[PDB]
Write a protein that binds this ligand. Structure first.
Ligand SMILES: BrCc1cccc(I)c1
Length: 215
């Protein structure tokens, strides 16, 4: 299930602790720079009506999850392609070899790429195995992006705040409206507590994860 069940248990545990009602709250003590993620989605474009969901990762790789449930990834060299078939099977190719098979999907990818480069800003830009987008969906309040490495990223439209959950290290990275970035160990938030804002979004995340699991 790509670590979602493990993520749900982590989120329930911290939310069950009611971290915003400790009294003596010390969020900073829950920080850990060893849990900082390597990968997250830095840009995205939703054209699901026609083609699919295009996105850029923080390494500047680009990808598309097409509506036929296939996925094409362009590495940051601008030429190397990874193609993920419906059945999970993966193959590697190049743009320069001009393959008849994927010419249309490559062309589409470049259109996504060009849009993001011209019109979108890169999230997480202020800081330092390539996963692909397994699935995504959006609510009125956010878009939920589940990567093949188990990470779940949640972008809230209203305030441009973001969550990146990593179940492997039982950690959450929180990006606030000031574009400020902090990574926390979930078990420690349980102990030292946190602000109402972070707590509310972890509750929202629990629910979004259940949705992913319900599909
Ligand atoms: Br039909 C041009 C096109 C195709 C895919 C994505 C985008 I943004 C634009």
């Amino acid at each position: 299930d790509c670590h979602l069940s493990d993520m749900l248990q982590q989120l329930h545990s911290v939310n069950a602790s009611k971290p915003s009602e400790r009294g003596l709250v010390r969020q900073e003590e829950a920080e850990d720079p060893a849990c900082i993620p390597i990968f997250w989605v830095s840009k995205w474009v939703d054209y699901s009506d026609k083609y699919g969901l295009g996105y850029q990762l923080c390494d500047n790789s680009v990808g598309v999850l097409f509506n036929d449930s296939t996925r094409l990834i362009l590495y940051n060299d601008g030429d190397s392609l990874q193609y993920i078939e419906r059945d999970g099977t993966e193959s590697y190719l190049t743009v320069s070899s001009h393959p008849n098979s994927l010419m249309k999907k490559i062309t589409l990818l470049k259109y996504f790429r060009n849009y993001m480069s011209e019109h979108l800003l890169k999230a997480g830009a202020n800081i330092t195995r390539l996963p692909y987008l397994r699935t995504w969906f959006r609510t009125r309040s956010a878009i939920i992006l589940h990567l093949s490495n188990g990470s779940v990223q949640i972008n809230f439209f209203q305030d441009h705040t973001k969550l990146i959950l990593c179940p492997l290290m039982a950690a959450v990275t929180y990006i606030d409206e000031k574009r400020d970035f902090r990574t926390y160990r979930l078990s420690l938030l349980e102990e030292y507590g946190c602000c109402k804002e972070l707590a509310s979004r972890l509750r929202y995340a629990r629910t979004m994860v259940d949705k992913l699991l319900s599909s």
